[PDB]
Amino acid sequence: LEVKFTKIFINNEWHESKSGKKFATCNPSTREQICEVEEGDKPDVDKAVEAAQVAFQRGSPWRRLDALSRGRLLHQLADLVERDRATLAALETMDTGKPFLHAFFIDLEGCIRTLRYFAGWADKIQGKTIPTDDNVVCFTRHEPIGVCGAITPWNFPLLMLVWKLAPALCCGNTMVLKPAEQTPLTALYLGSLIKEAGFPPGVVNIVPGFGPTVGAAISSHPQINKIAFTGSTEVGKLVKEAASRSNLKRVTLELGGKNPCIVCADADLDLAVECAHQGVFFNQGQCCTAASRVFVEEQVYSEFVRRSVEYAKKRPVGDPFDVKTEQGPQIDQKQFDKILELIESGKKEGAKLECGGSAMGLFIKPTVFSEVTDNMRIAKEEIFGPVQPILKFKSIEEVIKRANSTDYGLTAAVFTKNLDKALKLASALESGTVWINCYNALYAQAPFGGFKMSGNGRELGEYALAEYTEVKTVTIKL
Amino acid sequence: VKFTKIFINNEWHESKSGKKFATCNPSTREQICEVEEGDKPDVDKAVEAAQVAFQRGSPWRRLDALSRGRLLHQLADLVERDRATLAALETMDTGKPFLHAFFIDLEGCIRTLRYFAGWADKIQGKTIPTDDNVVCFTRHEPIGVCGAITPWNFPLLMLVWKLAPALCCGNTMVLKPAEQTPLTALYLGSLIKEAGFPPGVVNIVPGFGPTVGAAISSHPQINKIAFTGSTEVGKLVKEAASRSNLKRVTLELGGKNPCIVCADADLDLAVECAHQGVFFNQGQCCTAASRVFVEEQVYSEFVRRSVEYAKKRPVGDPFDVKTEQGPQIDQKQFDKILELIESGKKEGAKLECGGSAMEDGLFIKPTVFSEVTDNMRIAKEEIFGPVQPILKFKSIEEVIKRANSTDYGLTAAVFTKNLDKALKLASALESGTVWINCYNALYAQAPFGGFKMSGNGRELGEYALAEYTEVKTVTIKL
Amino acid sequence: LEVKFTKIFINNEWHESKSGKKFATCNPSTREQICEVEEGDKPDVDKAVEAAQVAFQRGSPWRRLDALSRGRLLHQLADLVERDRATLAALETMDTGKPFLHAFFIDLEGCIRTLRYFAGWADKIQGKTIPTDDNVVCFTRHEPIGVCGAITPWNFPLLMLVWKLAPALCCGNTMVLKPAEQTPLTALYLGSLIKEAGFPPGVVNIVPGFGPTVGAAISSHPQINKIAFTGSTEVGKLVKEAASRSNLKRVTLELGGKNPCIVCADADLDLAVECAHQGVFFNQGQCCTAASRVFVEEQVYSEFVRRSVEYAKKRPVGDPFDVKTEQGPQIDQKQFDKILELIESGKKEGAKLECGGSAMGLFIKPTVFSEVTDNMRIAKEEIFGPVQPILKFKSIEEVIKRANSTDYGLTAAVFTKNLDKALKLASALESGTVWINCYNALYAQAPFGGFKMSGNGRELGEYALAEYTEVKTVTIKL
Amino acid sequence: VKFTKIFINNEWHESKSGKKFATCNPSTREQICEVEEGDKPDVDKAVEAAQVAFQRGSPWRRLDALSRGRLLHQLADLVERDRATLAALETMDTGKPFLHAFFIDLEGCIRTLRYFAGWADKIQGKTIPTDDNVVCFTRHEPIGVCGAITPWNFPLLMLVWKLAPALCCGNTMVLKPAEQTPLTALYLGSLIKEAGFPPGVVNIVPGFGPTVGAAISSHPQINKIAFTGSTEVGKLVKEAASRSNLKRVTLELGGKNPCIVCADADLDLAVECAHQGVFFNQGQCCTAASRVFVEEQVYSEFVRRSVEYAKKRPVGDPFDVKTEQGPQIDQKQFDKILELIESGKKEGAKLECGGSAMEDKGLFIKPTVFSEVTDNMRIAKEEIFGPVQPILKFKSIEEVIKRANSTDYGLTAAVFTKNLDKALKLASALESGTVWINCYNALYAQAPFGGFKMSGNGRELGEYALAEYTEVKTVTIKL
Ligand SMILES: NC(=O)c1ccc[n+]([C@@H]2O[C@H](COP(=O)([O-])OP(=O)(O)OC[C@H]3O[C@@H](n4cnc5c(N)ncnc54)[C@H](O)[C@@H]3O)[C@@H](O)[C@H]2O)c1
Ligand SMILES: NC(=O)c1ccc[n+]([C@@H]2O[C@H](COP(=O)([O-])OP(=O)(O)OC[C@H]3O[C@@H](n4cnc5c(N)ncnc54)[C@H](O)[C@@H]3O)[C@@H](O)[C@H]2O)c1
Ligand SMILES: NC(=O)c1ccc[n+]([C@@H]2O[C@H](COP(=O)([O-])OP(=O)(O)OC[C@H]3O[C@@H](n4cnc5c(N)ncnc54)[C@H](O)[C@@H]3O)[C@@H](O)[C@H]2O)c1
């Protein structure tokens, strides 16, 4: 499979970098180089931001479109992505090491449902008419914010981009996007379909490059109105801070978590075992929603640990293009070493290994730690790799205090047949999403986001539209 | 003056340092009293009080939704009871005409409280259609402990715009008034205790910016901070939030608000509205109409009648029945104003009245400048004083570009009888509020806030609830 | 306690019937006459409708009020009802035979919560701004429907009146009310409070009288815009048909039902026994929400029947004014003879009397039927008196078909600890309200109403506002 | 004409009676085909089929929300693929200019389908805060089996305004097109089947009013009905609904809609708008501008410019690219109109053009303008539904308000003025479901439509349409 699109994307034309520089992207499954990609910088960002400003200029074609046509263009874009679903899944797998079937049936399915879902909102973005006084007409407009910058991570490259572009374009904004340096490939392909669908030049522009260079340039730009970042807490902090330093641009942040997973005695234990396994080990464990703190009630603890080890010892690891591969390699050696060091962490600290604990190329064998306590490091640091740490609890209100004691709050899951327990837990957990008797159940129509240091604002759902619009009161006196 | 101490757990406290700052009457230039000077150790005590008041099982948490509303109505009952006392303190602290604080500043607080009293049992999440065997819904939960930082120009009302939605939504608060204007907030606490609010739901720490405010903005257990004040400090607040615990942030900041006048318009209506829109609150108001664009056909007549309005504006003792304009807040502001006046002369604008102080005394003569251009300082910097600069224009598409030329975007006003002209302008002005044939037309039910660098979220109306709640998704598999 | 209000209420003035006729109202507790009431007719109706028309006329004081003042007037009325709480409760007990404490702590509490809840909606009824084309402004108004008529039954006189008047006034309509002929007293007393709160003349008018006479004049009236009826299916059918044949006025109906009460094996039996008993015998069983069909899984059945009988054998029956009286007399002899004929029915048909079955005065003692089948009379006909029948079932899917087997669908209740059983039943029961491990849990903020033949619109919650507003599209082109 | 039979369970059926009725082209004045004549026993079978398809556990009920939407998009794709065929039949059955049915009627169907396609995964209930230990929420469930009864003036489009929201929300349907205009509905049935809607989700029974329509409105297992047609039959529908099972009812009825012209209006813009608003679809329109109030001081100049617009309006064969007005729908309407015209003279209005038919053979009526009209005349009170523009005269805004609100009708209103306050004051005072300003017939799938007072009950189009096709359930849980 050959990589067509490697340049910078602006006014629906392909540009090479002003500096002339280029950077490489590698296949984590072979460690070998894939291609060279134009490396943009502050000069390239400036150009893209101009373009998106002109395309947003009042009187521009994009602004003159009627709402329903914005939806038509997103439905066409989604049509093209379905036409080329296999290519895109494959570019994604070469760049991230993800199983091809996971790329094809998950990442791409999510991009199409998201794109279609927000095409549906485009003529349904409604403000309000407000009663005040007898002789007054007062109403509200949900106007487009303007120029929106988007900065995405390496673990769900295409999908995270789509979570932003889909509501942004639906609402009538324009965009300058920046993929992670590790994985520019799909984003760039997508830009080819954006031309082929009909989007007027300048509505979407794309500058690949590095964090402290292209990304900082966006976050600090004086004529970008709004920025949406998905990635690490560390960088999220800087992005909000550069945003406020510069022009006070609006900010959406989705960051990581140490997400709890609570198993009650009265759970259906195999559903629970099955979902905590999938929740830990999906996408090589390199996923923001990973189920990295599994609390089990004392009475079913050993039976839970046992059954989980079976699942982990039997999980096929290999070449992501093999159809039976359920786990590929980590993204690169930098993550590889990060993970194994943290396994040492728990060894060094008293946790009980039950399987794995070593490498196997860039593969790490599925690892289960038994008998984990809150103060351990694999219990407080997001591991972001195939490591399942299992803890033990006695009380319902005990487990609540313990799950809520991190600084983060992205996700939680609870497993029980008991109506009163499921709901009482769902209300008390400080989490952006609480799954009950399921894990990784995501929907285009259900909002997603963090409490606390897991982030700001929401993506997906009707709630995404609040992030891409500016509210205007018009008040008329008679 | 009865209330001077730090308010925590419905109790009055001396500063942990024992220090005290003085508050002063800008009319008499005499000192009203001394107020406890808080610092970070005081803020810690208040935040802890608000945390405890917010734990699950807490009296405040276990209250009915509708009970929260009844609590807000009883408070608004109390403010209406002590309405004259409160308006009186506010006039002492700010120099504001007593009748203005009584019929405007105080009237806003009672209706704001009443409006948000009615929202308590109407904060509604969503139930979301997904799959045949899935129940998925969203809950609008309180963010938690909420910080307010308010300015000196509308001390009690800018307070209430924050306190009122916050409580309605079930949060707790730590409030910091401006060092110049602490009294009303300290009095409001006593009414909160008399109203039956459980202790710790509201805590008030008076003191200063780089001290108490900075403590509030970077605290690790404040979840959300709401700021009204200057742009320079708003940036600092958001930076502190971004760098501490990523707390949610609302900003209401200033503006350079245009006031557009077509030859079409009711000139008598425009001249008074523009006049009241520049001079209200001694010009010290976020919504001040500091850039009056007039169509040349009616230009000179506008200047003539505005000059008359200004020459006849009664300036004097705020407590006298007929005072329309009191003294500026303090000597720092006073000098700021005269210095910007002078720059206008030095740069070529045409003085038509005022330009001077009066009895040295903190009063400034109502000042009108004609022949103003966009490059001038009196046309770009926010004066916060009784200075009305009048500009000139010819075409509508010319006026739009000139008005949107700031980095600000709080407020705009348009005067015309032409249906299409009115609506075209309402759509094109990049401002949070566009008034048509009125000015300063504010309602608890219409939201308020800035485009661009004038601010971030919204206060008042239904949109204010967005800023004091967190969206959780609960997804259940069957 | 002496009745003060006996006459017809129109333009805030008391009036004798045009005919001079009057009808008596009697105390079921005694069988004796309480007083005489002016009996209106089509002539008096016509006069009331004109009052409502003039007060709803454009430019009238009522229409000139701002929305938030409609709220104040509702808060003021609620305050009056709370001030005279015990008197209204007593008038209602005199007229219905209801326990005073039930009149005081339920009926009246529901009136005060409803008045206050809909006071909060008045300045919060919002239409929409709709995006279409570049040069078009389109928005909607939720305008007031106009003159609304309201017709209530005898079993909750004040409460059912309030359920219509609170949302109707909240949205700015005007009304003509009609109590049941059996209970006019409290409706009329309320009218005196309406004058005392400050509602403009004509906003509310009351014309007591009989169904086919005053009630038909309302349903048929060419200048009433909306009718809201609570009562019998038979009369509800006629009201809708008269409304259609006349002027096509809008219609709300809340009718009766045969409401199922489903008990699973894993239910908390004592809770389930407690609520199914209370849900049958509340208000002497004379309740639209009554649990006249109790399905039990045949593992707990006899143990359910047993404990049920203990509850029925000891529920104290006596003078509604005695503190410990939990069951008063039936509304009159006509209702009395309906129930005990219906008992006979079940005897013939093979049901097992477990207790009761006889009279004692106008009192019926708690009667429980066991071994009850779908085809029995007491399983299909609304008993509307203290008769608890108990059925038996094996499957979830069986009980689902059997409960939906009616033409009615007002309420349902479900008892189980099982998360999946609760929700499955909740989604599958064709009922306007489904309770889970509770019964008769009503809130001002939660809508109420019927599926199928149990009713049409909804009452309470935001959803009631739809029944009292008319939608207008305004579309402007530039 | 490939499709003439009864559509039930995505199959085709002959009437149980074996009877058929004729449909005829109002331009040829000849018969197009025969269509099965249904009666109650066929409506029972269709209703039955709609129930089984609606049973819990049925395919349609197990689809996820988004796939319901994907189906509606898929059907809108087919309507656009066969756009010409569908617009043609419509012109054959109605007399409508082909180009009007292609660019207006058929375009409204595709946008309506596509707008409500997007709503299927966005029908959102509420969660309600009550007590510390209570979970309370609402669900917006499908009402169940829905029946539609549509008129002959916009056959396909009035059908789609009903089918689209209903399907979106997961209902099933029994449709009945008007006996004059069955063809498009039966063609639609094929496209619903080719789109892969499960059998029974949509069922179509052609036939007559006191027959099939009455059978539908009184059916004990139809849960909800949506009716567009005349007021007199709308009353009958609601009555039958009340006598049977209290099924929910939506009514879109007629109007006598005012069109108000201020002196400060763009007169050229008002003239054409007023003209196209009276004469569209040969005047046979619920939105028709059947009462043109003009201010005295542009009055006679308005009349002058309208006459010119009328005398130059090309009447003729609907398939000629330059026809702007075809023939009336049949002889019955034809006589209605002429009989209302003559009474116009009898009562003293000033004919200014038209007032007669044209051919001896044809069903064409000359564009007819009346001046010097007054509120008491019949052409000012009764709905003409034909090419007749009566122009009235007024002085005051408060006077024009009272006069315009004086009907029992209240569907639609139009105001022409440049004055911001005049515009908005009238928009609040006019008791009408839709008030246009400086435009006419400005309809969008996103904006609701329907009557005040006797012009109807509910709304169609916009989010408000979903309210008529769902049933609200509260679920309250105690902990
Ligand atoms: N040495 C450490 O302590 C440490 C800790 C954690 C992660 N890391 C490194 O960061 C990576 C985390 O992976 P990730 O992509 O999911 O999260 P990330 O936050 O590092 O990157 C997310 C997105 O933000 C961009 N970005 C990075 N820095 C930016 C900046 N200052 N301004 C604007 N944008 C910026 C990135 O190019 C990317 O597109 C790891 O590969 C690891 O090498 C290092
Ligand atoms: N051109 C200038 O010299 C300039 C510029 C900006 C601000 N200021 C000062 O601010 C005042 C403007 O009036 P204002 O009250 O409306 O705006 P402000 O900037 O002083 O902010 C007002 C509120 O924010 C608080 N605050 C101040 N500094 C803070 C900090 N570092 N962190 C957290 N909170 C802080 C203050 O206690 C006050 O309650 C002026 O009087 C002036 O002294 C001056
Ligand atoms: N006042 C009048 O003069 C007047 C007005 C309108 C229609 N009509 C006559 O009605 C016929 C159709 O005109 P229209 O389509 O505009 O209005 P309409 O109300 O008669 O028909 C609309 C729809 O309702 C159906 N329908 C008719 N009677 C029904 C009934 N009893 N029960 C259930 N459904 C029924 C029809 O088959 C059609 O589908 C014409 O023949 C016309 O002459 C007369």
Residue numbers in the entry:
A (entry chain B), C (entry chain A): 27 to 386, 390 to 507
B (entry chain D): 29 to 388, 390 to 507
D (entry chain C): 29 to 507
The authors write:
The ALDH1A subfamily, comprised of isoforms ALDH1A1, ALDH1A2, and ALDH1A3, regulate RA signaling important for embryogenesis and development. Following the first step of oxidation of Vitamin A (retinol) to retinaldehyde by members of the short-chain dehydrogenase/reductase superfamily of proteins, ALDH1A enzymes irreversibly convert retinaldehyde to RA—reviewed in19. Of the many ALDH isoforms, we and others have implicated the elevated expression of ALDH1A3 in mesenchymal glioma stem cells (MES GSCs) as a target for the development of novel therapeutics. The lead compound, MCI-INI-3, is a selective competitive inhibitor of human ALDH1A3 and shows poor inhibitory effect on the structurally related isoform ALDH1A1.
The three-dimensional structure of human ALDH1A3 in a complex with MCI-INI-3 was determined at a resolution of 2.8 Å. The final model contains four identical protein chains per asymmetric unit, arranged in a tetramer, a total of 257 solvent molecules and 4 inhibitor molecules. The molecule (MCI-INI-3) establishes multiple interactions with protein residues. In particular, the ester group of MCI-INI-3 pointed towards the catalytic cysteine at a distance of about 5 Å and its benzodioxole moiety established several contacts with the protein environment, including an H-bond with W189 and Van der Waals contacts with T140 and R139. The phenyl group of MCI-INI-3, which makes a π-π stacking interaction of variable quality with F308, sits close to the protein surface and appears to be rather flexible, being poorly visible in the omit electron density map. With respect to the specific selectivity that MCI-INI-3 shows for ALDH1A3, our structural data revealed that its pyrazolopyrimidine ring contacts N469 (N12-NH2 distance of about 4 Å) and its ester group interacts with T315 (O4-OH distance of about 4 Å), the two amino acids that distinguish the 1A3 isozyme active site. Such stabilizing interactions would simply be impossible in ALDH1A1 where the two structurally equivalent positions are occupied by I304 and G458, residues that cannot establish electrostatic interactions with the hydrophilic portions of the inhibitor. At this point, a complete determination of the Michaelis-Menten kinetics was performed that revealed MCI-INI-3 to be a competitive inhibitor for the aldehyde substrate, with Ki values of 0.55 ± 0.11 μM for ALDH1A3 and 78.2 μM ± 14.4 μM for ALDH1A1.
